[PDB]
Ligand binder design. Structure first.
Ligand SMILES: CCC(=O)c1c[nH]c(C(=O)OC)c1
Length: 103
């Protein structure tokens, strides 16, 4: 559980990141046309936060799966040169970097 301690570390670092603004809260399908249709399994940092505090992560691979899901959804719905897309690539590279330099 140096595992789940690190998950707390990297989640907090992601939550406080400059490019984290599109992923702090769940996407509002009422405000974003087509998101409900295109993204099957929505995921964000607050949802990951809620599950983490309540100990809902069996292990670190489950945590990583949700994090990558956030960035997979981002690249699926948003253009790479869009403001959200650009922020997503920064966050995705940040996660993979910090995650790997530990594991
Ligand atoms: C219309 C705004 C929009 O397309 C959008 C807002 N948030 C996202 C998103 O995918 O953030 C995760 C897309």
């Amino acid at each position: 559980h140096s595992d789940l301690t690190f998950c707390e570390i990297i989640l907090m670092e992601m939550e406080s990141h400059d490019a984290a603004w599109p992923f702090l809260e769940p996407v509002n399908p009422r405000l974003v046309s087509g998101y409900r249709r295109i993204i099957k399994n929505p995921m964000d940092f607050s949802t990951m936060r809620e599950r983490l505090l309540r100990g809902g992560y069996t292990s670190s691979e489950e945590f990583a799966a949700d994090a990558l899901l956030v960035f997979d959804n981002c690249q699926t719905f948003n253009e790479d040169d869009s403001e959200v897309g650009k922020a997503g690539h920064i966050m995705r590279r940040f996660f993979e970097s910090r995650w790997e330099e530990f594991y």
